[PDB]
Amino acid sequence: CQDVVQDVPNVDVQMLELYDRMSFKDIDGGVWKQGWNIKYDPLKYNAHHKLKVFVVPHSHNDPGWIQTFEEYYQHDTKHILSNALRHLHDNPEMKFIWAEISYFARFYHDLGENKKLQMKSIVKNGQLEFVTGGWVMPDEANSHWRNVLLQLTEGQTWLKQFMNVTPTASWAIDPFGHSPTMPYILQKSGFKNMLIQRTHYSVKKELAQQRQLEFLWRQIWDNKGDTALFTHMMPFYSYDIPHTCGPDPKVCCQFDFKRMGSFGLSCPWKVPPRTISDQNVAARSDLLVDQWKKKAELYRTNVLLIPLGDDFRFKQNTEWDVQRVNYERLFEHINSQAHFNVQAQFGTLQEYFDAVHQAERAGQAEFPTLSGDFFTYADRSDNYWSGYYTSRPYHKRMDRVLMHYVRAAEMLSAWHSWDGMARIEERLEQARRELSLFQHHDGITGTAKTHVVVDYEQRMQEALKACQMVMQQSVYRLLTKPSIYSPDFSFSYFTLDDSRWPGSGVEDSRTTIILGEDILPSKHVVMHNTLPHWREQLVDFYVSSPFVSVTDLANNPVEAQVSPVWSWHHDTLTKTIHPQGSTTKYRIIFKARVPPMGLATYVLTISDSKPEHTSYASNLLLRKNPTSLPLGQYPEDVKFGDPREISLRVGNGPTLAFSEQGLLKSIQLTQDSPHVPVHFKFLKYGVRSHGDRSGAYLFLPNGPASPVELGQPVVLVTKGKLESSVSVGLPSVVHQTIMRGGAPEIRNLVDIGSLDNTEIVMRLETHIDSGDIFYTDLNGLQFIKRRRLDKLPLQANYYPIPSGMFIEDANTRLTLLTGQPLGGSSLASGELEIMQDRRLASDDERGLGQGVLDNKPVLHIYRLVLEKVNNCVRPSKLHPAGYLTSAAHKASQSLLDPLDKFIFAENEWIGAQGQFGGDHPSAREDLDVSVMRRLTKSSAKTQRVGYVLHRTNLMQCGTPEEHTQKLDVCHLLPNVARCERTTLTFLQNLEHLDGMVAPEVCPMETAAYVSSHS
Ligand SMILES: [O-]S([O-])([O-])O[C@H](CO)[C@@H](O)C[Se@+]1C[C@@H](O)[C@H](O)[C@H]1CO
Ligand SMILES: *[C@@H]1O[C@H](CO)[C@@H](O)[C@H](O)[C@H]1NC(C)=O
């Protein structure tokens, strides 16, 4: 295994190093506004060395943005695809590339058989070529790598089944900045080449000057280069026709033949396209070839890529004709005039890359190596696209919830083969496709119109219900005696109970377990643990009595704590935000212990008085002018006091101190250690009153944030043996710090209300001597070193926080893990900050045509880990990566993949069993079974089950290793007949494995395996 910590890779371009050196001056470069006047030697190309030009027709089809997926399909995309089928069928030399398989599958299934056959023929013959082949072209900033892989697999599995093709070239022309997680996944999925477009205009200029726009993109920790993927970065401001023929858009616009008038389009540079004729083709070709030769100067080979397309292009039959016939006249002239020394033709993306690599192998060019990322993107001036790291945060959090529900549903149901009447495959396909659709770069990014966001939300709600149905049918089958199991595939044997989604204060969605002597004495509950190691976690349920005790199925008592159910209310009469307690529902909390990838059953039983093994939390409400707070049968009366500082400690965990406003002020790790200053603060950013306004995409603050005025907020302190917490009702945020014995959990119920033109940020202030360095993750996969640059504006120093961020000095580190992707930074030494929500009245001129005024309450969740790191073996000062400790990684897993909870619906569960998975291997902590998916329906004689195994890399800090069993996923199911290593999409077998054993993977590696069972 390669060492991902101690060996700094030697690359030609390292993006953090490049950023430190670049000046980012925004000077007017002439017609190429963000470049320079390109010059070329006319003698460079001659009869023995011609410029080969591939004009690649394309149509960017957003799966929802300003219309819903179905609205665009009916008004635009179905016409584009039907007319592409006809025009390619009738014009053999015409070509077209297609990226979004969600639309293609929607179209293809509605085609009659004769047309399906015609479509398969134009794909097989190379006229229509799929690029990437994912369900969507995903966002690369907020998306979790697991979901990027899920949507890639959904589109490519469809393409292999119906079109018999698997793309090896990727096309990503619209995500707002680019992540190295893409080449990571693509290179492990059979790809050979990729293309990107939205990178900072200063980066395009710098790389163009050095002819480094084509590069071998490797991961930041990869010393050898085995992860490398050839990448082409486009050079100009847009993928539209004016910015793809060459440097001067006033000239390129004249070659977009849809802009002459009858189509309702024109050239903003004021020179229209003119139909090509025999009287103007020489002058028109002179102009076009000059643009092409200038563009060719930015690259190393004699093969030039010229995309020809724009949003929802190639719809009308007349449009296909006007583009095709005019370009055919240009090619016939150009290719026949030896003096140009050019051979131009319509081509596909793969044809371009194949020709570039033929030139490379002929020794015509060598390509540079590169590592790093391409965030934060700016398309012009100071317009940095860091707003969408936070926009529509409710749905960003929903993405992570559904991510986990899909994983858990696929894993729980994979253990058995299911009759088609159970509709398992149907429900899982629906859930995978709705979550995959949301990975679109106008979905999770929060950059779609209001009604489109509603459509994504409805799709995701249906997907959550589908996952619940599959999960609960699976639990019932896995835990009922086989000869008793009698399923009704439409029945709800269990209800899922989720304490954090939509969340307390967001939706009252949880069911109360109703017990009583005159109705039901007890209730079975079941926990599932999707992770491949034994895990303990506190779990809670709502119950109708405080006198409840817990047992495991061997009837062993389990210690429990009961606390009230508190809800916060914005009292419009008293003008205060304060908590109300229920007098008939209570929370019972206990530690569940669950096998690796397994299930554990417990029983909740009511008694007439306090049970021996159940304790009750105390509650203290701090506020002036308190009123009573009765709690029914709850046995401890609520106490009141004036606001004051307080300190709490659960178990032998850290001791936390809080200000009189209910906000953390210090953490003391052990009884003898220092009270380390760690202060939470809420602030607000505004919008500029002159100049460009923030919107869904752009963050354009009117200076540093200002503190939110807190008033004298009401603070609630709950103290228990198993769980304690401090909650405070602040303007727009109910902030809660929860302690269970380790790093605290933070929950914010964020309701920005009607505060227009406001962004609310949560900041941590410490005295850690971090300087200008901080770390943020990329897609939940890796942590990358960031350097704050005071030569860039504040918004340029914001980066995606898809799952975590940290600052550190020689001795101390503070890591904040998140349960949702949000934007954040470290704007000063010792600080971390992360945006909670943003409400913007204005459109930001990127096509959306509205502000962001559809905010709704969202429950954001986090873990806050303060640790000593002086003994940790860390990368050297020049390494571009960072790595989590064991505690921080487990805290991230507690947020993203918690235990699932099931409440048995009926009164009696006949045939109930107490555990599943007790014999599953408990794998080393850095290994995860990211995906477990049965790949065959029940009719297949040979069943196949696919696994994606990911090993992260955790710092060595002196904690002895111990135990753990080797995990061989190929033997998790019985009767294994074959074990194969495959691409990550499961679509190609790469290795037949000896002894049917699937080896574990190296740190930072991801592999896929398929086991076959007789
Ligand atoms: O913004 S426009 O309507 O002018 O369209 C341009 C050119 O066709 C297009 O690039 C928009 Se891009 C398409 C959409 O996915 C994205 O949110 C937009 C970010 O600006
Ligand atoms: C699909 O795969 C290849 C395409 O090159 C071909 O040999 C094979 O006959 C095709 N068969 C199908 C599934 O149509």
Ligand SMILES: [Zn+2]
């Ligand atoms: Zn787009």
